[PDB]
Amino acid sequence: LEYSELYPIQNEYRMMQSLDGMWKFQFDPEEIGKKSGWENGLPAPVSMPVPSSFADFFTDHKERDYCGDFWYETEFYLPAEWRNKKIWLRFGSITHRGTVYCNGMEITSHEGGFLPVLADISTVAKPGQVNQVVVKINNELNETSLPCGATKILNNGRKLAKPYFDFFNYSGLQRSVWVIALPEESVKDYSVDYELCGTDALVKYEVVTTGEHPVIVRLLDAEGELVAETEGKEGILQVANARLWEVRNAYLYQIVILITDGNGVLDEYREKIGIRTVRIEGTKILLNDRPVYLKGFGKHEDFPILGRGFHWGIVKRDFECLKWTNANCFRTSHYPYAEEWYQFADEEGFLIIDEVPAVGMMRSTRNFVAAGSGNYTYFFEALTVPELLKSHIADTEEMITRDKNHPSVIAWSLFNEPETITDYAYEYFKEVFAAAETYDFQSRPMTGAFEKNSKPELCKCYPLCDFICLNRYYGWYISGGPEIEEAEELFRDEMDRWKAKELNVPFVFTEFGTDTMAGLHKLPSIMWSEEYQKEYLEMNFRVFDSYEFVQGELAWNFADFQTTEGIMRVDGNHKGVFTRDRQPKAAAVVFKDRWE
């Protein structure tokens, strides 16, 4: 990467100033902004909170559902004392793609809506003056970038996003924005990897800087005491009597990376890390050499009004709920979350399966969204797939570079419900997995979540995985309700087929659930009732517990969340175990009791 993914810090060498607040915002349905000079200021803006998704503020459909180009603008005073620094705009994300301007000048563009965008404004920044940032953003969906979908043009020319995925197309500036100042020679990246040696541990590391001066690396314990120190851009820190980062029992050291010229220090980067190992051994997931059974949820970045907008309050409530259920794990379904989620998981000892936004790659869904009105003959995969692969690999590189040093991150999920039953899909995913392994200094477990279409007899992609994640809805989409006994039979039949393959890898259920409307009670239960959610879960548990190789269960979903409206979604997806405002349905206690 031609920029650093490192989270920004404030110290003697590095400065940061938040640009969060009310920005100026303007929709550009006619796509006239750039030729009209909007990069120098929006002509008729409204106010827009940052961070937030824009959609749910408005009271009219066309603004909520807006699809196309739209622009953000703000101004900030740059301290004069930042003069002799490399000055960057850092967006937590720009959803889905955008071009950043500063003081009227084009700085950078980015594709991918869920990872940081770094824009080097050093050459146009005006220290000791007010500066301007303008961002052109686009939220259309296509088949050459993630997540996948289509864009429909309505009779009036109005665009409408048509996802191939089951979540609302929230977009905008959904995460915090900073302007930061770095030393001219700085720490750009580092990687740690761990080895356990009895009571001791080794922290292997690499550091990438933007210069040639010597590097010193120190490790401090949770009290700030020096426990190890070495020199060089590559090395090993030896930690006596190491306090390991444990599941639901975190311990964090602080790594301190210094660039020196002998006379003094040029840069200092510090970050909390946790000494822990993760590996797959047969059907076991080993954390610090001991098996762990994953218990938790797929989540979303989703909350009323804010949409995917980041807020520490959502983090705090969600973790309190997670702990109350006795969970130990979540998957970042279906995109990398704001960095703060991982920082907090590190502190709380939660395990994370970190997922790239490779969702929407199922052919039947694509075809369905094309058949709506209307198309049944024209598709061009041969042309788009190579471009999609490039985008997928780029997002993977960005995710892993951003997240690798979190002790919480124990696995990469490289897809959710793609086509996997052709040799072509194998060749596609082989490249993604190869890239992931190359970018991950730890070479930690890699996986993806498979839809039921990936039958054990047909799937060509599970051998790429270190463990296999299954999304299954036996008792919801398949043989629901009065047919639930048949659902259980079908589920056991499938798992018997997996069993007979004797793959000797762990299986984790990454999704299972039922839409459940809080307050819908029925005796006997019906699909959509709270009681049916409980019974469905009990049936699933009986199945899970029948197979030795099943080593985790992440329910879909932690909480009800927003989707595109339609005949199958009653104000979003109601498969939450909690409501959207984070309160438990009856099924939450079922998990609490089982996971205790």
Instruction: Indicate the annotated binding residues for beta-D-glucuronate.
Output: 166, 334, 416-417, 477, 511, 556, 569, 573, 575
Where do we find the tokens 């686009």?
A: 138
Residue 417 C-beta: closest distance to ligand SJ5, Å = 6
Rama region for 580: left / alpha / beta (φ>0; ψ in -120 to 50; rest): alpha
Tokens of 88: 């960057």
- Closest C-alpha to 510, from 371, 414, 404: 414
397 binds, among a copy of itself, ligand SJ5, none (CB under 5 to 8 A by kind): none
Of 301, 397, 494, 511, which one is the catalytic site residue?
Answer: 511
Specify the pairing of strand 97-102 against strand 215-220: unpaired
Beta strand 21-27 pairing with 46-50: antiparallel
- Considering only the stretches 4-12, 131-139, 270-278, 522-530, report the one whose residues sit in contact with a copy of itself under the rule CB under 8 A: 522-530
Question: Which of the following is catalytic: 5, 39, 355, 417?
Answer: 417
Which of ligand SJ5, a copy of itself, none binds 166 (CB below 5-8 Å, type-dependent)?
ligand SJ5
Residues 117 and 180: their CA atoms lie apart, in Å, by 13
- 528 near a copy of itself, judged by CB under 8 A: yes
The residue assigned the tokens 């548990």 is 541
Report the site for a copy of itself in 537-576 (rule: CB under 8 A): 564-571
Long-range Cβ pairs for the range 426-435 (8 Å, 24+): 426/460, 426/461, 426/464, 428/385, 428/389, 429/461, 429/464, 430/464, 431/389, 431/393, 432/358, 432/389, 432/392, 432/393, 432/396, 433/464, 435/393, 435/396, 435/397
CA distance 261 to 524: 75
Q: At what angle do helices 587-595 and 530-544 cross, to 10 degrees?
A: 30
Q: Which amino acid is at 379?
A: F
Nearest distance in Å: CB 559, ligand SJ5: 12
Question: Would you count residue 304 as binding a copy of itself (CB under 8 A)?
Answer: no
Q: Looking at residues 357 to 376 of the shown chain, list those that interact with a copy of itself (rule: CB under 8 A).
A: 373
From the list 486, 579, 592, 595, which residue makes contact with a copy of itself (rule: CB under 8 A)? 486
Whether the Cβ atoms of residue 400 and residue 356 lie closer than 8 Å to each other:
no
Helix (H) or strand (E) holding 399: helix 381-403
For a copy of itself, the closer CB: 209 or 479: 479
Distances (CA, A) of 193 to 72, 196, 274: 40, 10, 10
Minimum gap (Å) between residue 513 Cβ and ligand SJ5: 7
Asked if 530 interacts with ligand SJ5 (CB under 6 A), we say no
Q: How far is residue 449's CA from residue 294's CA, in Å, rounded to a whole number?
A: 15
For residue 226, which phi and psi values (nearest 5 degrees)? -70, 125
Q: Show the binding pattern over residues 63-102: x = contacts a copy of itself (CB under 8 A), - = does not.
A: -xx-------------------------------------
CB 554 within 8 Å of CB 330: yes
The nearest distance, CB 402 to ligand SJ5, in angstroms, is 22
Subset of residues 154 to 193 that bind a copy of itself, contact rule: CB under 8 A: 154-156, 160
Q: Is 530 in the site for a copy of itself (CB under 8 A)?
A: no
User: In 512-587, which ranges are E strands?
Assistant: 550-555
Question: Residue 54: which of 311, 304, 306 has the closest Cα?
Answer: 306
Residues with Cβ within 8 Å of residue 463, at least 6 apart in sequence: none
Using an 8 Å Cβ cutoff, are 101 and 39 in contact?
yes
In the complex, least distance from residue 384 CB atom to ligand SJ5, rounded to whole angstroms: 22
Query: Which residues have a Cβ under 8 Å from the Cβ of 282 and sit 6 or more positions away?
Result: 504, 505
Select from 132, 332, 471, 529 the one that contacts ligand SJ5 (CB under 6 A).
Answer: 471
Strands 446-450 and 468-471: parallel
Q: Work out which of 476, 544, 549, 591 binds a copy of itself, going by CB under 8 A.
A: 476
CB of 451 to ligand SJ5, least distance (A): 7
**Closest residue to ligand SJ5 in the complex (CB):** 166
| Identity of the amino acid at 567 | I
Q: Which does 511 bind (CB under 5 to 8 A by kind): a copy of itself, ligand SJ5, none?
A: ligand SJ5
CB-neighbour burial class of residue 34 (10 A; exposed 0-12, middle 13-18, buried 19+): middle
209 binds a copy of itself (CB under 8 A): no
Is residue 120 involved in binding ligand SJ5 (CB under 6 A)? no
Distance in Å, CB of 413 to ligand SJ5, minimum? 12
With CB cut-offs between 5 and 8 Å by kind, which of ligand SJ5, a copy of itself, none does residue 66 bind?
none
Q: Which is nearer to ligand SJ5, 108 or 529 (CB)?
A: 529
* Contact between 302 and ligand SJ5 per CB under 6 A: no
Tell me the closest approach of the beta carbon of residue 565 to a copy of itself, in angstroms: 4
Site string for ligand SJ5, 154-173 (x = CB under 6 A): ------------x-------
143 touches 384 (CB < 8 A): yes
Contact 341, 333 (CB under 8 A): no
* 575 contact choice in ligand SJ5, a copy of itself, none (CB below 5 to 8 Å, kind-dependent): ligand SJ5
511 is annotated as an active-site residue = yes
Site string for a copy of itself, 115-154 (x = CB under 8 A): ---------------------------------------x
Instruction: Please give the distance of CA 65 from its chain centroid, rounded to a whole number.
Output: 23
User: Closest CB to ligand SJ5 among 333 and 551?
Assistant: 333
Residue of 241, 272, 240 lying closest to 256 (CA atoms): 272
424 binds, among ligand SJ5, a copy of itself, none (CB under 5 to 8 A by kind): none
Q: Going residue by residue from 551 to 590, which x/- string records binding to ligand SJ5, judged by CB under 6 A?
A: -----x----------------x-x---------------
Enter the tokens of residue 19.
């640009």
Closer residue to a copy of itself (CB): 262 or 566: 566
> What letter represents residue 39's amino acid?
E
Minimum distance from CB of 229 to ligand SJ5 (Å)?
A: 46
Query: Which residues sit in the known binding site?
Result: 166, 334, 416-417, 477, 511, 556, 569, 573, 575
Provide the pairing of β-strand 468-471 with 507-511. Answer: parallel
Closest CA to 415 of 395, 444, 387, 385: 395
**Positions in the binding site for a copy of itself (CB under 8 A):** 58-61, 64-65, 154-156, 160, 373, 476-477, 479-483, 485-486, 489, 515, 517, 520, 522-529, 564-571
**Could you list the active site residues?**
417, 511
**Positions in the binding site for ligand SJ5 (CB under 6 A):** 166, 334, 417, 471, 511, 556, 573, 575
